Amino acid sequence: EMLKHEYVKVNGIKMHYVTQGKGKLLLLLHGFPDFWYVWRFQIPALAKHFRVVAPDLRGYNETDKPEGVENYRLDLLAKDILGLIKALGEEHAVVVGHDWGGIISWTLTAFNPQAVEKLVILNAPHPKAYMTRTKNSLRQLQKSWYVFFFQVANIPEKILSRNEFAFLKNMLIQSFVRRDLLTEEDLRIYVDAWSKSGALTSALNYYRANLNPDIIFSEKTVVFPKIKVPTLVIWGEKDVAISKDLIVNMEDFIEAPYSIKYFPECGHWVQLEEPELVRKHIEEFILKSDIHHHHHH
């Protein structure tokens, strides 16, 4: 059965996703400035075993793009995924998230553990670690320069988009470990998703709603339940956007089986750089029995 495109109403918006395979629901959630297509190396391999669903998140590509910054608050983003699980006819999913998708995945898992059977994170800090540590970390504040850039209304969208997205392409390419990670053909495909009307504003609204300076430098402390479901973290260490300072003691946030696979020579997009090892680690993690009553048989 091939890859198919589908559209479903969730949490008041119409969400586009692609799906391939049958079996356990395995959600793959992209981040900025990607869309479902970031998972193109994992979808067919994982679809050999699982029902893979890769949505475009609120605001992105073919998904609806509500107006207004407060329509991009993280609680709504997580509810979109909760609603997607239900709309797919399911009650539980294995949830894999990269970048913003990882932020949403940590959140959904912490606040809605009933919906998440197992959690996989690629290169997204735990939200509490980001909120606690960034204000005190010059290294992270530097790496988060673009978060502050994106807070200004109107102007960042125009800058990123001018000259057929020259700055967005350049800023994206400079975030990679090797400059040639995406082909020109990949870049054409990305420009098509970036050009959907309203998409770029909606994507930057995630930073305006959730990472504005009042939040970053808040004196309030964020209450975040411990993660209570098995968790796999895949981490490219050469990540331009996230300091290793933010993943120190990351296992403290987890009260369940936890494994981390470090990729010392990979950056923020390990799924594009070591696709086969990513696929393998995810599959082994999902298929591992949680009950071990036949050692060495």
Ligand X SMILES: C=C(C)[C@@H]1CC[C@](C)(O)[C@@H](Cl)C1
Token code pair at residue 169 = 């392409």
**DSSP secondary structure code for residue 183 in this structure:** -
Please identify which of the residues 16, 30, 98, 268 carries the catalytic annotation: 268
Token code pair at residue 85 = 């699980």
Helix locations, the chain, DSSP H: 43-46, 74-87, 100-111, 127-133, 138-143, 145-149, 155-173, 184-194, 199-210, 213-216, 270-273, 275-287
Find, among 2, 149, 27, 163, the residue nearest to 95 by Cα: 27
251 binds, among Cl ion, a second copy, ligand X, none (CB under 5 to 8 A by kind): Cl ion
Q: Does 186 bind Na ion (CB under 5 A)?
A: no
Q: Does 251 bind Cl ion (CB under 5 A)?
A: yes
Is 55:27 a contact under the CB 8 Å cutoff?
Answer: yes
> Cβ of residue 169: shortest distance to ligand X, in angstroms?
9
In the window 237-256, what residues touch Na ion (CB under 5 A)? 245
Binding to ligand X by CB under 6 A, coded x per residue (else -) over 98-117, reads -xx-xx--------------
Is 116:96 a contact under the CB 8 Å cutoff?
Answer: no
Q: Does 164 bind Cl ion (CB under 5 A)?
A: no
In the window 258-297, what residues touch ligand X (CB under 6 A)? 268
- The nearer residue to Na ion, 114 or 174, going by C-beta atoms, is 174
- The nearer residue to ligand X, 42 or 123, going by C-beta atoms, is 123
- The nearer residue to a second copy, 105 or 134, going by C-beta atoms, is 134
Known catalytic residue at 292: no
Exactly one of 3, 76, 159, 181 binds a second copy (CB under 8 A); which one? 159
Q: Does 234 bind ligand X (CB under 6 A)?
A: no
* 2 burial level (CB within 10 Å; 0-12, 13-18, 19+): exposed
Please identify which of the residues 30, 99, 190, 206 carries the catalytic annotation: 99
> Cβ of residue 106: shortest distance to Cl ion, in angstroms?
15
Task: Select the span of 40-48, 81-89, 103-111, 211-219 touching a second copy (CB under 8 A).
Answer: 211-219
Token code pair at residue 172 = 């994206």
> CA 91 to CA 289: how far, in whole Å?
20
> CA 58 to CA 249: how far, in whole Å?
31
Report, as residue numbers or ranges, the catalytic residues.
99, 207, 268
Chain contacts with ligand X (rule: CB under 6 A): 31-33, 99-100, 102-103, 124-125, 127, 130, 146, 168, 171-172, 175, 210-211, 240-242, 268
